[PDB]
Every structure is written in structure tokens, then in C-alpha cells.
Amino acid sequence: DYDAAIDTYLSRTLLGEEVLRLKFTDGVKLRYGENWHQSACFYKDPGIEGPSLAKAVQLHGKELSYNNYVDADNALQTVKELGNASPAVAIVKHNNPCGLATGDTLLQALQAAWDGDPISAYGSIICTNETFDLEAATFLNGKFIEIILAPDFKPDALEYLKNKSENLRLLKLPELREV
RNA sequence: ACAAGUGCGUGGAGUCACCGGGGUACGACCCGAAGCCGGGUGAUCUAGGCGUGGGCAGGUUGAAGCGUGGCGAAAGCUACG
């Protein structure tokens, strides 16, 4: 690190050619890639930043893969543009947030996005802006989702989904409603 | 029960007493436990429930809430009271 700094600074000050070192430490192999012979491996960053996939817990659900991470992040970015305040949600398929909603009590918003896309949908990445509740949990029942992101969850809700479903990659992100 | 043998019985001595021994049942030569069961007694102690009262020197710590002030484009972060 020390030396890297000594490089970046000097290359930007003394001379002009600037050098950007990257922040990709602690690795983890995933399933594979777009195809079975396309092995991808997530490399977390040591940076303490804030809302990021690095700091998310897979309560239950088979190991997330390439596409998973990708879309999940796109979703996160979508919900994070609206900056707290008004309740909001989102969804996404093949790197395409195809279902943003705001509204009041999530319920409506959530389903309104499901109306937005009632085709492809099945197997998207719901990205709510706060905790999920049974109201719409029963709406989600049958409507296959790949991953469900959320700042936090409610015990009964969490349990409910957990046992009922057998695929939802529940990946609520501890404290994402900040900078 | 057919027979043959055999068992028991048969040519009159028992019965009623008094004084004794002994067996058996009853407390049974005397004393010696824990226990079992019937009907009554007890919550002045102690355990718990309830009603209605009494009490806890003097200090310490300093949650939420509230006021003012900082740092911030906001998001938000933060000091003291």
C-alpha cells in the first residue's frame, strides 16, 4: 500500500501520467459464469465505504452467482438514487431495472412493479428500501424472485419466506439507508 | 361288589365331678418399634394467594425527551447544557 501511494502521488504531481491502483482484496469463487465453463470469483474491497454487496448476508439461499451480484448492484444503485424519504422498491432482469416504484406503504409499489413487468419478472431481484412485511410477502408467494434485497427484515416475514420458498436468495443488506 | 385277600368293628364299662399337667383360640408369662387404618385438631411458626397499611440514611451513574451550537450542497454526522 505504502509504495502504491508513493506511486500514485508523484505520478499525479511530479510528472503527469497518472496511475490508479485498485482496491480488490479478499476473494471468493462463485458457481461459474454466464456458461458452466466461465468461472467467476467475487473480490471484495477492504474499503469501509457503505452500502455494498461485500456487506450483505445470505440468510438463506443457494450461493449467488455472477448475474446475481451484477443485477443486485444495479438494483441497489437504482433505489439509492432516490435518497431515503419516500418508501420505494425496485426489480430487475438481465441488467435492466424494469420496475421502480415509490408510493407509500411498500405493498402497492412492490406489486405495481410486478404489474410493470408481469412477463420476465419471475426470477428478478426485488430491491426494497426498507424491511419487508407479510402483506406483500403473500403477494410474492408464487412469483419467483432470484434475490430479495432489503435494508433489514422482520422475523416472521423472514421465516415465512425462508421455509415456504426454496430458491429466494434472501440477501438483505444490513443498514443501506445512508451514504 | 365279581372274585380273592385285606381294613375297621364285634364275647357290657362308661359317665359326672374335685385337685393337677398339657394343647388350641382369645391381650394369653411381662415389657420392648417402625408402621397400617377411622374420626377430629392446626397456616400465632413456616410456604403461598388476597385486602388494607408502614418502610427503604446519604451519595453515585446519567437512558429517552428538550434547548443552543458546530461540521455538511444535502444525505447526514457531531459538542455542550
Side-chain angles (χ1 to χ4, degrees):
Chain A
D1 312 327
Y2 198 74
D3 300 330
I6 313 163
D7 185 78
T8 59
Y9 164 69
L10 290 177
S11 311
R12 302 257 319 291
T13 305
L14 266 185
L15 295 167
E17 191 281 354
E18 80 304 343
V19 185
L20 173 78
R21 315 257 186 170
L22 274 185
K23 284 330 299 163
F24 303 107
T25 314
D26 190 359
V28 295
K29 176 66 175 66
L30 295 176
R31 313 227 173 175
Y32 57 96
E34 285 316 340
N35 192 358
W36 62 274
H37 51 280
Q38 184 180 1
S39 52
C41 55
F42 182 44
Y43 298 158
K44 299 189 165 294
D45 54 88
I48 190 167
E49 317 300 328
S52 54
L53 276 296
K55 296 183 290 289
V57 297
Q58 286 185 354
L59 296 153
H60 83 283
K62 56 180 82 46
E63 67 275 16
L64 78 160
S65 191
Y66 176 76
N67 292 132
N68 300 107
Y69 281 101
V70 178
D71 293 339
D73 194 337
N74 191 358
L76 191 44
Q77 281 303 60
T78 304
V79 305
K80 294 294 290 183
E81 289 185 354
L82 306 173
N84 292 301
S86 176
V89 295
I91 61 157
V92 60
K93 297 298 295 295
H94 299 90
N95 210 359
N96 188 0
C98 64
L100 176 61
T102 61
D104 195 58
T105 184
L106 293 175
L107 200 158
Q108 57 85 39
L110 186 62
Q111 316 152 321
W114 201 266
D115 290 337
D117 185 280
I119 300 89
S120 160
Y122 277 167
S124 66
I125 305 179
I126 279 170
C127 175
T128 187
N129 83 1
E130 64 183 3
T131 281
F132 191 25
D133 189 62
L134 277 301
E135 75 275 16
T138 62
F139 179 87
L140 187 63
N141 208 342
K143 291 74 74 177
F144 168 32
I145 297 281
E146 186 65 25
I147 296 87
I148 299 171
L149 271 78
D152 198 36
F153 264 66
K154 289 208 283 200
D156 60 357
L158 186 152
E159 168 267 328
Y160 161 70
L161 283 73
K162 273 179 70 68
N163 74 291
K164 160 265 289 181
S165 186
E166 192 273 332
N167 55 289
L168 274 296
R169 301 180 190 273
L170 278 196
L171 185 63
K172 60 94 171 183
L173 196 145
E175 66 182 1
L176 58 89
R177 275 290 290 309
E178 68 275 16
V179 298

